[PDB]
Structures are given as C-alpha cells and as structure tokens.
Amino acid sequence: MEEEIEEAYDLVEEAEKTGDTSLLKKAKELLDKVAEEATKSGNPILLIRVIIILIKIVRNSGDPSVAALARELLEKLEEIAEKEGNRFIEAMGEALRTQIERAL
Amino acid sequence: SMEEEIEEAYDLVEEAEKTGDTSLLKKAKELLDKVAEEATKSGNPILLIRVIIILIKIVRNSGDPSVAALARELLEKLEEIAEKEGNRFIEAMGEALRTQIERAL
Ligand SMILES: c1ccc2[nH]ccc2c1
C-alpha cells in the first residue's frame, strides 16, 4: 500500500495548491482503502501514515469530520500499541493527537 | 543491542518516576548517550524516534537542559534521514516530537 499512501499525500498537496476539491475526493478514497487494510491487518505503521495525511487535510480545511476520523484511527492505533506493549507507538499516538487538535 | 538498551532506558525512567530515585534518570541518560550514537550510525529512524521519545519523558520529569539539547540534535539527524529518503512521514513524526520538546517547561 506504499504506492497508494504516497499518491494520497501527493493529491492532498495538489488539491490545496490548486483548489481542485475533486483531487481531495480522490485522496480520501485512497486513504479509506489504506485505512481498511491497516485496520484489517492491525498494522500501526500504516495507521500512523494515514493519520499524518488526515492531519494535513484538517490543517487545510478545518473539516471537523476529517478530524473526527483521525481521532477514530488514533484510538485504533493506541489499541494496537497497548495490545503489543509498544510504549513508543503509544507515545507517537499522543504526539499526533496534539497535532490534530492544534490543526483545528 | 540497541533495542534492548532503549527498552532498559525507558524502564529506568519509569522506575525513577515511580520511586523518586533520580540516580536512575542519570543511568537512563547514560544509556541513551550510548544508544543515540549507535542509532545515528545505523541510520534507523525508528531507533532515533524511540530515543527522542524517552528524552522527552526525561525533560518533563527533570527539566534538564542537556537532555533537551540532545533531543534537538537527534531531531535534526532524524530530519536529515527523512530528507535523504524522501520520507514525508518521518518528517511529520519529527515535527510532532519537536512540538513536544518546545512545550516542555
Ligand atoms: C513509530 C514510532 C515509534 C515506533 N516504535 C516502533 C515502531 C514505531 C513507529
């Protein structure tokens, strides 16, 4: 899913530079598919990548529903980190939680 | 080697904060000095991130300026890796950790 996540990041940047919201629509379709695979495989690193792009979207638009989705995925990430006993992923999750709130 | 030492450093900071024994913070910073140098040579961004996370924890519990100075030096090294690799996700994780450093008292 490396190709899709990098393309999604690219489209988020192009959408903000051009104002073409159809590109943000496409980016979000890519992000949904990556999120679905991350959640189905319990992959915290993929989730972190999705969350990072969602935060970018929230900075650019202030969309509360995108913020809500990012918070949803952060809870899922913290669940995986606690399940696996990885305190560092847990701390990253908390550092990203701060970034969501400051982006609103 | 490095991962074990990192886990021990994190453990010692938790033990220091649990007991109030600041000599364990000292030992953790010693371990982190050694690992920070190893992880910089490995080029492994995860290991750098783990070390920075523990340094942030120590700054909050002690305020030690030299600990914060090391965290900033490693955040610079982490950003160089991100640039070299074209990895915007490492860049974003570095920025998120830098916000935490800049908000310590
Ligand atoms: C991001 C942050 C911390 C981490 N610890 C192990 C993997 C990993 C990824």
Tell how far CA B82 is from the center of its chain: 17
Residues 6+ apart with CB under 8 A from B59: B67, B68, B71, B101, B104
The answer to whether A100 and A57 have CB atoms below 8 angstroms apart is: no
Distance CA B59, CA A72 (A): 30
Taking the C-alpha atoms of residue A22 and residue A28, their distance in angstroms, rounded to an integer, is 10
How far the first Cα of chain B sits from its last, in Å, is 32
Sort out which chain B residues have CB atoms less than 8 A from A52's CB and list them. Answer: 88-89, 92-93
Range of the domain at B53: 2-102
Which two tokens mark B36?
Answer: 């920070």
> Angle at the Cα of B4 (from B90 to B93), degrees rounded to 5?
15
Helix (H) or strand (E) holding A1: none
Q: What is the resolution of this structure in A?
A: 1.9
The closest of B45, B51, B50 to B79, measured between CA atoms, is B45
Helix B45-62, helix B65-85: angle, nearest 10: 160
Look at residues B98, B101, B99, B79 and name the one whose alpha carbon lies nearest to residue B90: B79
With 0-12 CB in 10 A as exposed, 13-18 as middle and 19+ as buried, what is A59? middle
- Chain center to CA of A62: 14
Partners of B10 on chain A (C-beta within 8 Å) are 87-88
Q: For residue A1, how many C-alpha atoms fall within 13 Å in the half-sphere facing its CB? A: 20
Tell me the residues of B at the A interface, defined by beta carbons under 8 Å apart: 10, 49-50, 53, 56-57, 88-89, 92-93, 95-97, 99-100
User: How many inter-chain contacts (A to B, CB under 8 Å) are there?
Assistant: 35
Q: How was this structure determined?
A: X-ray
Nearest to B61 by CA among B97, B31, B21: B21
**Domains: count for chain B:** 1
Q: Which residue has the tokens 């030690």?
A: B64
Q: Nearest Cα to B92, choosing from A37, A78, A58, A85?
A: A58
